[PDB]
Design a protein around this ligand. Sequence first.
Ligand SMILES: [Cu+2]
Length: 444
Amino acid sequence: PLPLPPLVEPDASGVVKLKVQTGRHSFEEGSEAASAGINGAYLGPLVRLKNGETVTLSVENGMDEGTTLHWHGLFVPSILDGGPHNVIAAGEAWKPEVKIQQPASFNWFHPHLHGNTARQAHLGIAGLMVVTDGKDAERGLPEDYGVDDIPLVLQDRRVIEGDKVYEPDIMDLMHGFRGGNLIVNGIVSPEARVPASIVRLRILNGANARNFHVRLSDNRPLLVVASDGGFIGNPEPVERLTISPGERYEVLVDFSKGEATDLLTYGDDSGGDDLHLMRFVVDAALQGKVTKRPDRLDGPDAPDEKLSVKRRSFFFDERMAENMKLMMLEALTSGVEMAIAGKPFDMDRIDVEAKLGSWEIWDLTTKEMPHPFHIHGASFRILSLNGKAPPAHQSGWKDTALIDGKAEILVHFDREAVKSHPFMFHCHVLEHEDVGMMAQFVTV
Ligand SMILES: [Cu+2]
């Protein structure tokens, strides 16, 4: 059966308790591997927060090494977010108090470290974070958690038995770490039971590097209603949906005809054979609440490029000629280096000074492979992908986007970053970030 992240809401004191810890986890019957998680040995809860409330996010580090949590998609000033400038020491706690005021959205959280992100993420440390405004019923959206509103965290694994679970070699550092065992919510090939009705799937790619390109085995449409930053005004059906690390999409799927169906992904970025992710089976005993599809939601209007006060450009520089020379591991000591802002990430260097509340257009370019861009502490609208306006499903507010050739994005710097606590932007292939494909900004 598909495991469900436990639902956690603020307690009588306004607190959500999150304890990062090591353990062991079974991905498949009969085996177990070393792991780490939040409030358990792998993955974490789904924390549901109401727009307008104040919550204490009480994080305890129950490990023997430092960790952090980045509130990936949450709107906070940088002093309330986690990263390499404010590591939680082994055995210690961090209890930021957040006042939520942002669009309803499906967000998440996970470590964000200097040189160590890939390992801690792959071990399994992550959780989910929904911001709700209580209006989903009025939108016509399924909202019964675990029944017709189901989170799917897509990942991959090289190792499902044993203690040596994340052992990247030089090719993994250069190209990203991938494995052949696909998992959903921590299990190989789970099965979900669903009502014969419209079901909402809240899909996160939580892998180190792998891109998923998902369809159902009978090609039924995936009605995309939201991405990272919330709803789109004109939901779009797609037959196959690309999701890169760090991206989220909420989709509606109609199970009303009662037929079982498999979720599949292309096995690579070149249309390779589909691989099985999971199965959906319809349970006739359930009466599903939502039978009609929504056509219109409360999303943003078209982006306005005239708002931009500066144009920037960044190139995802894999430094292949220099790194292949090295080839002919631990990221920090490997010798491999990459860059997003000209030179590799440097903790003491500020790459960008952005005016607070301002808009900028950023040109993003790749060469050898695609890269998922993520910015902390800001939001963006995709203006173009390879010269073309984005499809509707990719047109709303986003914080993470797969760049493949050229993109142009419209960034809004709406949250404050002080010099002691810069925000960051980076590739979300965790190996690339760990070898330097990361940069830092402050607001001015
Ligand atoms: Cu990358």
